[PDB]
Amino acid sequence: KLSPNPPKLTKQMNAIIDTVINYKDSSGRQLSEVFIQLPSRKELPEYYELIRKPVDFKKIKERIRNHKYRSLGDLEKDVMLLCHNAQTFNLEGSQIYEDSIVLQSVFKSARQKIAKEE
Numbered sequence: 001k002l003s004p005n006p007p008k009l010t011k012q013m014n015a016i017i018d019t020v021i022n023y024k025d026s027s028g029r030q031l032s033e034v035f036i037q038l039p040s041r042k043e044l045p046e047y048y049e050l051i052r053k054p055v056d057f058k059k060i061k062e063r064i065r066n067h068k069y070r071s072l073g074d075l076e077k078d079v080m081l082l083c084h085n086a087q088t089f090n091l092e093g094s095q096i097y098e099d100s101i102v103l104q105s106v107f108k109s110a111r112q113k114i115a116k117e118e
């Protein structure tokens, strides 16, 4: 039986992503900043050539709003993809690559705290 996303579920998804977006490291840097929006096609076409399924946090929020994720697992898949793409395009040890590893962890913590699924 297909059915709409319960408002409870949508609110959880938004709280989890807000936690990830709002996260600041110990120096006060908001790690999500560069990841909110993809590079433009014009300025970085090689990104769109190398990366099969580009995604940014703007698109993830839109997919929540449009009820494209049907589960926390769907949401996780897109956040993991975002981070995977970062680690695909960017060099090991770069700030962006390292940040993406932290954000994966922040996501997994936020999901545990906010959904309490265990």
Ligand SMILES: O=c1nc2n(c3cccc(Cl)c13)-c1ccc(C3CCNCC3)cc1C21CCCCC1
Pocket (backbone or CB within 6 Å): 034, 035, 036, 037, 038, 039, 040, 043, 044, 047, 055, 056, 057, 082, 083, 085, 086, 087, 089, 090, 096
């Ligand atoms: O993997 C990413 N990787 C990058 N960006 C991403 C944005 C959202 C999601 C992901 Cl997963 C990435 C991103 C965005 C904008 C610029 C800039 C914004 C300022 N003018 C030039 C393009 C750059 C980038 C890089 C690629 C180039 C090196 C830095 C990170």
Ligand SMILES: [Zn+2]
Pocket (backbone or CB within 6 Å): 084
């Ligand atoms: Zn891959």
